[PDB]
């Protein structure tokens, strides 16, 4: 996260961190949507242009209080993956279209003050909240190129497809959307390669619930003027999520 503020405790109880076993290495952010199902970007597990092809038994997940590092009692809970599900037409050769993966936990996790799942949006919620200018939130580790001690939170407005389109030479699709600040909005901010930002979330004013509308997917550098982070359009991919889960 670049140009963010200090996260509070259990501000993001859904935030799930993904680590490579050998060596202990942070890969990506993710979100908990039930006691056993974890939503993330396909590009975190699979990207052959970089020779990245991770599997169940190479990966670790950490959940809960990120250990307020006053070296006093650690409770970041550690879970293992039964199954990974990469979207079958994740267009990794072209523009990363359908940048979405599911991960089943080996053992279902118990909910606490620090571990609670995020909602997946319905038709009316998505129609209501997916507007240019409406702000969502990403939480990750701050960028000074790796991770600082305290979680950073950044609020970014959704951008008009026309400005998204005119801002990059990559073919953008209905399965993506871009968020962030235009030059001379004043406010800046972005996610970055490695901060494990994971979910882009929004708070429904109709029922006070946090919904995941996006997944950190791709960008061209970090926090640039006339550039915007791209987010997997979760809602438009919901039928896939339902079909993997309901047919498990």
């Amino acid at each position: 996260i670049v140009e963010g503020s200090d996260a509070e405790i259990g501000m993001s109880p859904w935030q799930v961190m993904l680590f490579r076993k050998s060596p202990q290495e942070l890969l990506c952010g993710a979100s908990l949507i039930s006691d056993r199902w974890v939503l993330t970007a396909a590009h975190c597990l699979l990207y052959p242009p970089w020779d990245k092809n991770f599997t169940e038994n190479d990966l670790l997940v950490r959940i809960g209080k990120h250990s307020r590092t006053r070296y006093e009692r650690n409770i970041e809970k550690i879970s293992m993956l039964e199954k990974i599900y990469i979207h079958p037409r994740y267009n990794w050769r072209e523009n990363l279209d359908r940048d979405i993966a599911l991960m089943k936990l080996k053992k279902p996790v118990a909910f606490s003050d620090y571990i609670h799942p995020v909602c997946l949006p319905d038709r009316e919620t998505a129609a209501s909240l997916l507007q240019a200018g409406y702000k969502g939130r990403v939480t990750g580790w701050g960028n000074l190129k790796g991770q600082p001690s305290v979680l950073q939170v950044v609020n970014l407005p959704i951008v008009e497809r026309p400005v998204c389109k005119d801002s990059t030479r990559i073919r953008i699709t209905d399965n993506m959307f871009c968020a962030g600040y235009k030059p001379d909005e004043g406010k800046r901010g972005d996610a970055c390669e490695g901060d494990a930002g994971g979910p882009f979330v929004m708070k429904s004013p109709f029922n006070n619930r946090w919904y995941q509308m996006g997944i950190v997917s791709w960008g061209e550098g970090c926090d640039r003027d006339g550039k915007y982070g791209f987010y997997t359009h979760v809602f438009r991919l919901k039928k896939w999520i339902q079909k993997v889960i309901d047919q498990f």
Binding site: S5, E8, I9, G10, M11, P13, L32, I33, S34, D35, R36, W37, L46, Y85, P88, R89, N91, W92, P108, F111, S112, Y114, H116, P117, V118, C119, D122, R123, A126, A127, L129, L130, Q131, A132, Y134, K135, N155, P157, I158, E160, R161, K165, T173, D174, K203, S204, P205, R209, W210, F235, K238, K239, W240, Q242, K243, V244, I245, D246, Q247, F248
Partner: protein
């Protein structure tokens, strides 16, 4: 001449992608595997190894090319219409076919009915530092 509905009506025999790759059979193991969790239009006939657009992909007709995820390619037809670029919150299809629950507790597990309400905030009527900024931006 030109081809409507980004290939949704196409019945031709074009069996090679735009990278010059040969289409695999719709009916092959590696293709049936990659199709399990996708939502195809039944109207669209998955014949032989012909580039179809079963899932209404607005890029157009395609076909499996190998068996691992991402192993598909598009095919060069002469579309009249570059698909109208809908905005982020437009054209959002319906998901119900019926807070309300969407998933099946057997496979999904518990937590859906309770999702998105944080125990250290929304359960205890405590605003967080920044959530003001979000709710401010949702008015216009």
């Amino acid at each position: 001449q030109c081809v409507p509905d980004r290939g949704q009506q196409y019945q031709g025999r074009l069996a090679v992608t735009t990278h010059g790759l040969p289409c695999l059979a719709w009916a092959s193991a590696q293709a049936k595997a990659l199709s399990k969790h996708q939502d195809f239009n039944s109207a669209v006939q998955l014949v032989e190894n012909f580039c179809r657009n079963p899932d209404g992909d607005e890029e157009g007709v395609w076909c499996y090319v190998a068996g691992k995820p991402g192993d598909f390619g598009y095919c060069d037809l002469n579309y009249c219409e570059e698909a109208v670029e809908e905005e982020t919150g437009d054209g959002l299809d319906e998901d119900s076919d019926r807070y309300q629950t969407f998933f099946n507790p057997r496979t999904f597990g518990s937590g859906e009915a309770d999702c998105g309400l944080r125990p250290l905030f929304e359960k205890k009527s405590l605003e967080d530092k920044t959530e003001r900024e979000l709710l401010e931006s949702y008015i216009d």
